[PDB]
Design a protein around this ligand. Structure first.
Ligand SMILES: O[C@@H]1[C@@H](O)[C@H](O[C@@H]2CO[C@@H](O)[C@H](O)[C@H]2O)OC[C@H]1O
Ligand SMILES: O[C@@H]1[C@@H](O)[C@H](O[C@@H]2CO[C@@H](O)[C@H](O)[C@H]2O)OC[C@H]1O
Ligand SMILES: O[C@@H]1[C@@H](O)[C@H](O)OC[C@H]1O
Lengths: 530, 533
């Protein structure tokens, strides 16, 4: 068969691919969304199933208060010595001269097993990677962040030995590579192939100038000579290409002795090589390319920009059963694996799937602008065309209580259709819009909800560059809210600030900024792509 | 003797004054600085001593990650039924349409005692106050925050009964007061005086339009009639007055049957190039606390000397009780507890960031995150409390990479600070570096790097603050001081200069170490001198 890119749809950046026998695994970054890291599994490189989200405890990942697009940046998943190794970061500062953030290591015998508590590695820069040297030694690579005024912040690739027995980095750290003229060198990954060390890096930054670079040396600490046709991957020069932002790659040699490269990519809604390259409401997604070797150097098959259709390896086609319900009626004892919360775990602080059977109950907490405790359960936008739908029982008694359907990028960028209370009108349906923290409520006439309506049905219809909300009081006749919203406003390319690394989500939310923790009961959640 | 204002100098805003027999207490807000809430004590209203900081545990106050000028906003301290009651806030969102934050109550039998773990009250707006009605019932008041687009955000004063037995608010909440045209109505305090309810509020916001408003009613839930000469306190109309931003007041009746009003105020530095009517000034010492005397006419209080406040106020008829200082001019860290004038940012002082016992007679700080981090900073600091002072320390620090730095810092928030630090250059060895962060614009303006010789065990660091400016100097033998020729502006560390929706603290000076490599490299500070004129 063939591989159709992207193989991971919607917000799934920074792919780290690894092999264990005939099983393939890919870890992707999750930023402020909890639980942390997503790990997918494949047996053919075509089809991938969401298999685990390892960082489930605050003892592993504590992100209350983390800035937007802080938290878990690029992870590294490897398999060696009969166990899985996961290297990850928790970034606490994403703007200004510093980038305060810590790198950790956890392990497990299976990706869906219990993962260990973390070992502190270092804090000296993001994109940490663990290299299992053929000698048996272990090394941690990461980019080096340089805060100093007269130095480029992307200071090169650092290497330091990791001692398994001491559970710490040991000895001296070395900068083994300063990068090519594209600069912004990061995402380091070492490979030892036919007695040669290959250093793979990302360069150019994760916007439309993104690229993958490779270099090689006979010693682990260099010096490294760069690929003669570098970069091996980039879509910068091809603004019409369906895959953009191609970079941050990792390499796997399959058990069939074939060579593939996983990388992140974005699929924009377009608007010219140097400006107006589009908007990516689905964020950064993951693609896989085939590699071909010539004279000890790898080349992406088909050219530097990547291909939508890639020759699949010589493996058995293996598709997995879907891992979410088109209509989740909340019959399971825990939330389906495609739902995430912001920053904190799903506990009785914010909600319950057992208090009211067959409902998700959310106790109203802080607003959508809060980096702390939000009663908000959401899942990724993973198509340009879908409807999402919910039914909510909510009886607010003051104007500080609201619950309903949300489409969300970060604390400053979201829209919400919520049942709330107005002292003069009673229970009402209100549309709130937050655009880089500029707040508007654009319905001139509020929508009035009769007291006798037990459930308010809420729907969002996403149709590429626009989406629109609708509602119903009986689920048969649907009223459309004639305010068309721009999908591009929920995109990496629109929002302000240093962190622009996630993607659009849709979910169920309740807020009560009066203090009463008033519950909202959601009967089902439908997510139906086209 | 007279009361000389401000009675609490430097960053000491939102004063809540209360009487316990013949002892007087005032609680002030502390925002992101930890431990939370400062309580001062007085026996004559002239002299005040720092008595306690009640919120010492993460179980009472957990602020890791809080925005700058979030955290503990205005507190309310009362004494009733033989115990102290402290209402406080933890604000989590300080920008945009929402102001997410929660209000809590804790109690204690003495202000320096062990305070209880908190009772949740509400989240509906800040400036919570607890009122002890003569009937024995209790009520919580606070401002009501309105996030809706078309509405003024200060939606009025809410009132709701508190049940001591159920440890929760009960019954209906009511808006009892909507304010005056000054708007931004906040800081509610109720008083029951001669069978009339007096509602005191702040209005106009805490910059130069700040004012104190008072209203009265026969019933606790109103409606309330406004003072005929409202506001009773403001300097809005008097740009040249030495006290500015006067508002957020509280009233005490002394045991001598005299009446006083505590309020916050700023003492701005002015520019000669600007009109004081257009550029009202810059306050590096933040919002401070003053006390005015009250007189009554026709059932309304008035501020003695006029609405603007006095610098020198007639003291009540009590015996003078002066206190000795509560900090050492030269602190040599011989004690195993940090002196009470030192605070940390957001988190408790533990082994995570430092120790005074690991290396005896030194403050040891383990390098952690940068000064721009809202999470874990190894930074111990105290308030600027004079326009003219010297602060000095001596640091033992042997950095091995450029991500390690330790030294003397002057600080307003994560985006506004300067630091003179021992650090490491790959081509020069140990150097002394000056870093400047100004609304997150970062510079290191020293042209020629200052090499530190390997044989120097301690580097001595000094800042001289002189109203509009301040300047760093250094020494390798503590005998001769060397100039760092970069003049710094004190007004850049002030409420009036920093950007963003939280502008509520004041400048601090202290000792800091960072290691953004991960090795938690320690810096040992031998002493900390803070010497005002
Ligand atoms: O670490 C991952 C990378 O893909 C990328 O890292 C860089 C962080 O700073 C940004 O300004 C750069 O453009 C970006 O390449 O994004 C963060 C994380 O996804
Ligand atoms: O709650 C205290 C008040 O003194 C004051 O409250 C208001 C907070 O929002 C600002 O925009 C207003 O100007 C201010 O008056 O400041 C915070 C805290 O000290
Ligand atoms: O009118 C008041 C309203 O504004 C508040 O939200 O809840 C209680 C009511 O008394």
């Amino acid at each position: 068969m063939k591989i159709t890119n992207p193989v991971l749809k919607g917000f799934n950046p920074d792919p780290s691919i690894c092999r264990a026998g005939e099983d393939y695994y890919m870890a992707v970054s999750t930023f402020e969304w909890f639980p942390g890291v997503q790990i997918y599994h494949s047996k053919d490189l075509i089809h991938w199933r969401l298999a685990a989200r390892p960082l489930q405890k605050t003892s592993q990942l504590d992100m209350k208060g983390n800035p937007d697009s802080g938290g878990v940046w690029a992870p590294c998943l490897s398999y060696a010595d009969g166990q899985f190794w996961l290297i990850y970061s928790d970034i606490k500062v994403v703007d200004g001269p510093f980038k305060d953030g810590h790198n950790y290591l956890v392990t497990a015998d299976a990706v869906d097993g219990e993962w260990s508590d973390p070992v502190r590695l270092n804090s000296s820069g993001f994109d940490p990677s663990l290299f299992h040297d053929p000698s048996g030694k272990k090394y941690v690579l990461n980019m080096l962040w340089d805060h100093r005024e007269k130095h480029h912040s992307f200071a090169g690739i650092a290497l330091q030995e990791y001692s398994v027995s001491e559970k710490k980095l040991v000895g001296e750290r070395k900068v083994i590579f300063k990068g090519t003229p594209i600069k912004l060198t990061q995402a380091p990954h070492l490979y030892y192939i036919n007695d040669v060390y290959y250093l793979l890096t990302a360069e150019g930054g994760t916007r439309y100038e993104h690229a993958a670079t490779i270099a090689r040396s006979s010693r682990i600490d260099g010096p490294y000579e760069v690929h003669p046709d570098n970069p091996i991957l980039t879509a910068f020069h091809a603004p019409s290409h369906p895959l953009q932002k191609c970079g941050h790659a990792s390499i796997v040699q399959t058990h069939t002795n074939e060579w593939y490269l996983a990388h992140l990519t974005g699929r924009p809604i377009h608007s010219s090589i140097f400006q107006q390259r589009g908007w990516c409401p689905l964020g950064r997604e993951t693609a896989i390319q085939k590699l071909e070797w010539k004279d000890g150097w790898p080349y992406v098959v088909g050219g530097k920009e990547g291909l939508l259709e890639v020759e699949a390896p010589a493996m058995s086609v293996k598709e997995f059963s879907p891992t979410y319900h088109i209509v989740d009626e909340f019959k399971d004892s825990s939330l389906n694996r495609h739902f995430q919360t912001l920053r904190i775990p799903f506990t009785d602080q914010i909600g319950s799937v057992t208090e009211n059977p067959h409902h998700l109950r959310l106790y109203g907490q802080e607003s959508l602008t809060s980096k702390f405790t939000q009663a908000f359960v959401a899942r990724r936008w993973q198509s340009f065309y879908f409807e999402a739908e919910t039914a909510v029982s909510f009886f607010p008694k003051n104007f500080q209580q609201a619950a309903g359907l949300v489409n969300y990028y970060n604390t400053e960028n979201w829209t919400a259709l919520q049942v709330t209370y107005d002292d003069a009108l009673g229970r009402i349906l209100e549309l709130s819009v937050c655009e880089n923290l500029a707040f508007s409520q654009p319905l001139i006439k509020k929508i009035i909800i009769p007291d006798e309506i037990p459930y308010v049905y809420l729907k969002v219809t996403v149709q590429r560059e626009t989406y629109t909300y609708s509602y119903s009081f009986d689920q048969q006749e649907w009223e459309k809210i004639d305010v068309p919203l721009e999908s591009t406003h929920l995109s990496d390319d629109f929002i302000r600030g240093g962190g622009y690394f996630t993607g659009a989500f849709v979910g169920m939310q309740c807020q009560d900024t009066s203090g009463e923790r008033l519950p909202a009961d959601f009967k089902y959640f439908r997510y139906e792509e086209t």
